[PDB]
Amino acid sequence: SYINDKGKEVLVLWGIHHPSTTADQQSLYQNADTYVFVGTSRYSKKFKPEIAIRPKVRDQEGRMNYYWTLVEPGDKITFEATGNLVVPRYAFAMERNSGIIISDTPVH
Amino acid sequence: SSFERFEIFPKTSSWPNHDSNKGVTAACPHAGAKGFYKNLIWLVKKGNSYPKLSKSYINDKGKEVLVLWGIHHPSTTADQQSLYQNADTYVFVGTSRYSKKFKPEIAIRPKVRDQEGRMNYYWTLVEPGDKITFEATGNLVVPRYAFAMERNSGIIISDTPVH
Amino acid sequence: QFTAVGKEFNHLEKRIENLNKKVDDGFLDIWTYNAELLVLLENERTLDYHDSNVKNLYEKV
């Protein structure tokens, strides 16, 4: 668990790993049927790993889904897992205010 | 800009362990008799077994390939077993970008065209050189015809004559 | 107004992407047309204004 003790919104990112085979699931987490739960005052979602062989992208037959949520100042974020959770190490405290530019133009 | 309908998984050679014929319904009649979609095959059990299906396609065309499939949801557990022989089934479809598992939701729905069951229709665009994979233990309405195309507009709803 | 014209939409959001384009192409057509005609109409008035001043100077002498 984490409590937002900062005076602003905290961006928390995590991942849910989906192995290619049941043997790959067991050699990483030892448990066959696993679950991940993430919850705040607003956010609440259970994650169930979908184990299957996907077409190879960067030598990988498995997939990893990336999830994010904004934790309100004073609000609490909770992580519960029996496997497959790519856990947060670094989060981001921020005050939001624009757009994004795709360019090769030099900065000055 | 460049549309082409082609047989992605040929009916004759693709499905040797599953039934390609018995997947017809009164909901989709052809010549007054039970039929189905032309571009899809409702794969049912052969004898009393539905082995683990695993089929793949590589986009050898010089453009995007539109692949459509279906996930069938039977009304009762008895209807599930008389079509696929397996109780708890799953369907998996994956590309370099796409990846989704399908679990059949077995329940009695209100009758639409004499059917208490439902069939969900899914699609994805396969990139030139990319691979599409189908894995199933039941309930997969498999593709027969796919579409090679170059995208460029809108859609008009009208009874005005064409000239 | 402070505005960021740029927007981003994925492969399954082409309808609202085209709605965004319709908004941009809509403003483009409105502004190009109004700006062009405004110039045409004001240049006429300016050259007419100079004509008046030269005439009202002759018709004072």
Side-chain angles (χ1 to χ4, degrees), chain C:
Chain C
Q1 303 287 80
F2 185 97
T3 327
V5 185
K7 286 285 159 284
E8 292 165 344
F9 303 105
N10 59 62
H11 67 289
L12 294 161
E13 290 174 321
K14 197 72 189 288
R15 291 175 294 152
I16 51 173
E17 188 191 316
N18 289 316
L19 170 58
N20 186 58
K21 194 190 174 182
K22 191 171 80 169
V23 165
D24 291 355
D25 294 354
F27 294 152
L28 171 53
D29 293 352
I30 292 165
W31 281 120
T32 313
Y33 190 74
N34 287 334
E36 218 94 20
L37 281 181
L38 180 68
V39 164
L40 299 168
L41 301 174
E42 287 309 282
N43 288 346
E44 164 145 305
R45 279 202 140 268
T46 310
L47 296 175
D48 274 324
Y49 181 78
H50 289 304
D51 202 293
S52 299
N53 291 22
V54 180
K55 194 182 178 175
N56 288 353
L57 209 68
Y58 182 98
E59 290 183 349
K60 268 181 181 180
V61 175

Side-chain angles (χ1 to χ4, degrees), chain A residues 30-82:
Chain A
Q30 252 303 143
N31 308 134
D33 202 350
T34 58
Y35 76 97
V36 188
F37 202 90
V38 187
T40 68
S41 293
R42 167 179 55 189
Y43 197 88
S44 181
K45 184 163 262 71
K46 188 192 269 184
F47 305 95
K48 214 86 170 179
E50 297 162 24
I51 302 156
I53 300 154
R54 287 92 165 170
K56 283 195 173 185
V57 180
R58 298 170 64 88
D59 202 42
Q60 313 303 311
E61 291 178 348
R63 295 287 182 270
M64 197 178 282
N65 288 333
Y66 310 99
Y67 294 90
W68 66 271
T69 193
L70 300 149
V71 183
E72 285 172 41
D75 194 16
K76 196 172 82 176
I77 189 157
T78 312
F79 288 86
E80 186 184 3
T82 47

Side-chain angles (χ1 to χ4, degrees), chain B residues 15-19 44-51 83:
Chain B
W15 321 110
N17 300 327
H18 305 87
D19 198 299
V44 293
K45 61 177 182 179
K46 201 167 188 169
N48 283 262
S49 60
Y50 198 114
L83 291 167

Side-chain angles (χ1 to χ4, degrees), chain B:
Chain B
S1 185
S2 188
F3 208 70
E4 174 178 317
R5 176 170 160 261
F6 72 97
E7 201 171 11
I8 186 165
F9 302 125
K11 197 180 185 291
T12 52
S13 64
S14 299
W15 321 110
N17 300 327
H18 305 87
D19 198 299
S20 301
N21 302 310
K22 304 297 283 180
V24 293
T25 184
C28 302
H30 203 153
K34 298 174 183 183
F36 201 67
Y37 304 103
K38 226 284 184 294
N39 306 337
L40 302 172
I41 301 165
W42 192 350
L43 285 173
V44 293
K45 61 177 182 179
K46 201 167 188 169
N48 283 262
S49 60
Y50 198 114
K52 196 189 81 69
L53 189 152
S54 186
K55 205 45 162 278
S56 185
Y57 176 80
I58 295 96
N59 189 348
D60 54 68
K61 336 286 267 75
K63 50 206 172 186
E64 284 172 298
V65 170
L66 179 63
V67 182
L68 302 97
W69 66 97
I71 311 302
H72 179 250
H73 309 272
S75 58
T76 51
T77 49
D79 197 46
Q80 165 68 40
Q81 210 150 63
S82 58
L83 291 167
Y84 320 105
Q85 252 303 143
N86 308 134
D88 202 350
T89 58
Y90 76 97
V91 188
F92 202 90
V93 187
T95 68
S96 293
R97 167 179 55 189
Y98 197 88
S99 181
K100 184 163 262 71
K101 188 192 269 184
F102 305 95
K103 214 86 170 179
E105 297 162 24
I106 302 156
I108 300 154
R109 287 92 165 170
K111 283 195 173 185
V112 180
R113 298 170 64 88
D114 202 42
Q115 313 303 311
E116 291 178 348
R118 295 287 182 270
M119 197 178 282
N120 288 333
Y121 310 99
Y122 294 90
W123 66 271
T124 193
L125 300 149
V126 183
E127 285 172 41
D130 194 16
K131 196 172 82 176
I132 189 157
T133 312
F134 288 86
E135 186 184 3
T137 47
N139 303 62
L140 171 62
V141 175
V142 92
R144 191 189 171 186
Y145 294 96
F147 306 96
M149 65 178 190
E150 288 264 32
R151 285 195 307 281
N152 277 335
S153 188
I155 312 102
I156 285 166
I157 316 293
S158 185
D159 296 329
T160 310
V162 189
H163 202 80

